[PDB]
Ligand binder design. Structure first.
Ligand SMILES: CNC(=O)c1ccc(-c2ccccc2NS(C)(=O)=O)cc1O[C@@H]1CCN(C(=O)c2ccc(Br)s2)C1
Ligand SMILES: CNC(=O)c1ccc(-c2ccccc2NS(C)(=O)=O)cc1O[C@@H]1CCN(C(=O)c2ccc(Br)s2)C1
Ligand SMILES: *Cc1c(COP(=O)(O)O)cnc(C)c1O
Ligand SMILES: *Cc1c(COP(=O)(O)O)cnc(C)c1O
Ligand SMILES: [Cl-]
Ligand SMILES: [Cl-]
Lengths: 359, 358
C-alpha cells in the first residue's frame, strides 16, 4: 500500500536561502519531499529541508541505473495563485517507469497531493515574471546495498524544485539548428526510450557535444533504415506542412516505442484537434518526405515540444553534410505563436482550464 | 592531470567488521575514494567503508552518469594475492569514462591505488577452492545540476567483496536460458558495448520473465536473424562442428552489441594458442544452432565472465520450443579444460604474465 499524504511529516528549514534577484537546474528551493520504501513498505512521506542523500556505496541506483525521473512546471498567475500543468499525466508516466524498472508502485493521487503540499510550502519561490516558472523534479531510485542485478528491496522517492527563468529573451521564439546523422541512435523498438529513465540521457551527452562541434545546436534523432525523424534534443518533434496528398496537416511521430509520450506533445495534439481547422495526425515522418516537401515548398513549420520552452522552432538541419533550410520563421511562425499564446493563457490562468491543477 | 598513488592518504578503520556467502552483499573494511572537480583530481584515499553523501541533483542519479568495473583477485596457497589481467579492466573503464564524458585518469595510477586497497584488506581475500575477492570500481558524475551536460564534478570509488565458490561442489552445473526475440539488451549505435549502469536496470524485469517461464537466465537475441549475442551478464560461446565440417569455437564479434569481456578475450587467446581447432569471432544465429543440434554437431554452449569464468548451458527455450543443448553429455570437455587452465593461472599454480601481484 502507498504512502499517504494524510501521514505527511513536516520539518521547516532553519536555513532559508534568499530567492534569486539563472541557468536552468542549478538553483533549488528550501524544501524537498522524501519517502523511503523497504520490506515493511512505504514509510511516511516527509517534507524536509533541502539536504543531501546518504547512500550505501553499493546502492543499485549508482551501479545498475535503477533510477527514473519526471519533469513538470508550475506557474504563478497575476493573482499569485500557483498551478501545475496537467500533473496527472506526469504521475501516470512516472508509475509506468517505476514498473519498468521493478521499483515500487505508489498511488498517483497521493504523490500529487504530497507534491502540492511541498510546492505550497515553497510557494514564494515560484517566480511570476513573464515566461518564468517552477520546475518540479520527482525522482525514484533503487537503493539495495547489493551488487546483485536484482529487484531492489529498498527505494527512495524524492522531489526537488527549481525556479526557472524565461527560456526565450523577451518571450520571442528563436530557432535552432539540428544535426541529423543516422549514426546516433537514442532508442530502439522494444527498448526503454519511451520511459523517462536516467539511462536514456547519459549517453546523449557526447552526441550533443558532436552536434556542437559540427556547428549545430541540437540533435535530430533519426531511426530506422528510412531515417525516421523521432525526437529533437530532449523534445518531441512536430511538422506543419501541406502533405503529399495536398492537405494541410500537423504531424508528429506515433508512440511506437522510440518516442517519449510528452505532456506538451499530447496537449498540442489536443489543442489542434479542438480547433478543427486542419488535419492532426500521428504518423512516421521520414527524411525522404521532408526533403521532398522542402523542395516543393510545402513545409511551413518544424518545431520541438517539451516542458523546457513549450515549443521551439527549427530553421536548419544538417543532413548528409548538406544544410537544409527550414522556413519556419518565414511562416510566422504562425502555428508556433498560436500554441505559445494559448498555452501561456492556460498556464498563467488568463483562461480557466481543467488542465491546470491548483496548488 | 591524474591522481597519483604516491599521494594516497590512508585512514584505517576504527570499527572493523567480523569476517564471514551470497554474491555482492558482504563488503570489506575499506574503500578507495577520489573526487574530481574544476581543480582536477583531489588526492586519492583509502578509508573505512562508509556511505556516500550526494547532492539530490547529482547527475549520477538523474541522467545515469555512471559506469563500473568488475574483476577478481585470487589468493594462492602461499597466501600471495593476484589480480587477473587488471590492465584490461582499466582499459575498459577508461573507454566507459570517455563515452559518458567523465574525467580521464591514469590507468596505472588507479591500478596501484587498487593494489594498495586490496593490500590493506588482504585478510578479506579467501583462499578456499573457487573463492576470490571481487573488485568493484565505480566512476560517477556528480554535478548538482539538472542540466543534461558534461559534469564538472565526479567521484571514483572502489569497494571489495569476498566471494564464495560459484559452483558449490566444485563441478560445473548447467543452466537453462529463455530466448525470446522481444527482449533487447543492446543495439548497433547504442552503448551495450560499454559497462554502463544504464545497460543493467532494464534487464531486471526481463530476468523476472525468464524465471516465470521456467528458465534461469536470458539468452539475448538481436536482429532479424535472431543472433545469440550474450547470456545473462556474460559473453556466449559455442563449440561445434560448423556447416563447413570444421571443428570450431565461435563467439560473437565486437560489432557494437557485445560487451568485450576480459574472460571472453582470454578464452579466445587460450584456444588460439593451443592451435587445435578453429577459433573465430562470428555472429551465431538460432537458425544455425537449430540445424547444428539436429545434425548432432553441437558439443558445448557456455557463458563466460568474471562471476563463474565459464558456465555450461543445457537448455534453451526458444519462444515455445524447448531445446536440449548436449553440453554435459560432451564432457563438457572444453569447459573443463578452460576452467582447469584458468584455475592454474589465477591461483598461482602456474606463473603467468596475465596475473598482477598484490
Ligand atoms: C535551458 N534549458 C532548459 O530550460 C531545459 C530544462 C529541462 C530539460 C530537460 C531535462 C530532462 C529531460 C528532458 C528535458 N527537456 S524538456 C522535456 O523539459 O523539454 C531540458 C532543457 O533544455 C535543453 C536545452 C534545449 N533542449 C532541447 O531539447 C531543444 C531545444 C530546441 C529544440 Br527544437 S530541442 C533541452
Ligand atoms: C552468484 N552471482 C555472481 O557471482 C555474479 C557476480 C557478478 C555478476 C555481474 C555483475 C555485474 C555485471 C556483470 C556481472 N556478470 S560477470 C561479467 O561478472 O559474469 C553476476 C553474477 O551472477 C549473476 C547470476 C548468474 N549470471 C549470469 O549472467 C549467468 C549464469 C550462467 C550463464 Br550461461 S549467464 C549473472
Ligand atoms: C521528457 C521528454 C519528452 C516530453 O516532454 P514533456 O515535457 O512531457 O512534453 C520528450 N522527449 C524526451 C527525450 C524527454 O526526456
Ligand atoms: C562485464 C560483462 C561481460 C564481460 O565480463 P568479463 O567479466 O569482463 O569477462 C559481458 N557481458 C556483460 C553484459 C557484462 O556486464
Ligand atoms: Cl516555459
Ligand atoms: Cl570464479
Amino acid at each position: 500500500s502507498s504512502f499517504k499524504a494524510a501521514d505527511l511529516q513536516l520539518e521547516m528549514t532553519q536555513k532559508p536561502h534568499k530567492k534569486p534577484g539563472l541557468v536552468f537546474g542549478k538553483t533549488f528551493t528550501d524544501h524537498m519531499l522524501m519517502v523511503e520504501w523497504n520490506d515493511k513498505g512505504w514509510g511516511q512521506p516527509r517534507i524536509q529541508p533541502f539536504q543531501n542523500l546518504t547512500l550505501h556505496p553499493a546502492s543499485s541506483s549508482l551501479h545498475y541505473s535503477l533510477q527514473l525521473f519526471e519533469g513538470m512546471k508550475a506557474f504563478k498567475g497575476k493573482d499569485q495563485q500557483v498551478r501545475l500543468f496537467r500533473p496527472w499525466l506526469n504521475m501516470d508516466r512516472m508509475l509506468r517507469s517505476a514498473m519498468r524498472l521493478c521499483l515500487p508502485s505508489f498511488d498517483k493521487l497521493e504523490l500529487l497531493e504530497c507534491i502540492r503540499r511541498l510546492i505550497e510550502v515553497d510557494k514564494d519561490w515560484v517566480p511570476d515574471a513573464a515566461g518564468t516558472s517552477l520546475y518540479v523534479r520527482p525522482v525514484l531510485i533503487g537503493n539495495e546495498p547489493s551488487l546483485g542485478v536484482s529487484q531492489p528491496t529498498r527505494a527512495l522517492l524524492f522531489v526537488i524544485l527549481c525556479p526557472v527563468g524565461a527560456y526565450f529573451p523577451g518571450g520571442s521564439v528563436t530557432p535552432v539548428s539540428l544535426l541529423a546523422d543516422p549514426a546516433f541512435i537514442r532508442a530502439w523498438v522494444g527498448g526503454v526510450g519511451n520511459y523517462k529513465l536516467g539511462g536514456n540521457y547519459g549517453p546523449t551527452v557526447l552526441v550533443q557535444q558532436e552536434a556542437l562541434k559540427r556547428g549545430c545546436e541540437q540533435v535530430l534523432w533519426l531511426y530506422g533504415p528510412d531515417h525516421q525523424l523521432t525526437e529533437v534534443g530532449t523534445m518531441n518533434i512536430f511538422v506543419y506542412w501541406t502533405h503529399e496528398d495536398g492537405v494541410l496537416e500537423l504531424v508528429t511521430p506515433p508512440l511506437n516505442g522510440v518516442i517519449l509520450p510528452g505532456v506538451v506533445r499530447q496537449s498540442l495534439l489536443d489543442m489542434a484537434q479542438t480547433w478543427g481547422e486542419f488535419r492532426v495526425v500521428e504518423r512516421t515522418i521520414t527524411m525522404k518526405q521532408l526533403l521532398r516537401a522542402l523542395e516543393e515548398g510545402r513545409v511551413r513549420e518544424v518545431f520541438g515540444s517539451g516542458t523546457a520552452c513549450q515549443v521551439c522552432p527549427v530553421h536548419r538541419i544538417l543532413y548528409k553534410d548538406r544544410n537544409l533550410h527550414i522556413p519556419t520563421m518565414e511562416n510566422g511562425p504562425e502555428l508556433i505563436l498560436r500554441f505559445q499564446k494559448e498555452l501561456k493563457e492556460i498556464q498563467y490562468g488568463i483562461r480557466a482550464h481543467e488542465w491546470m491543477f491548483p496548488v
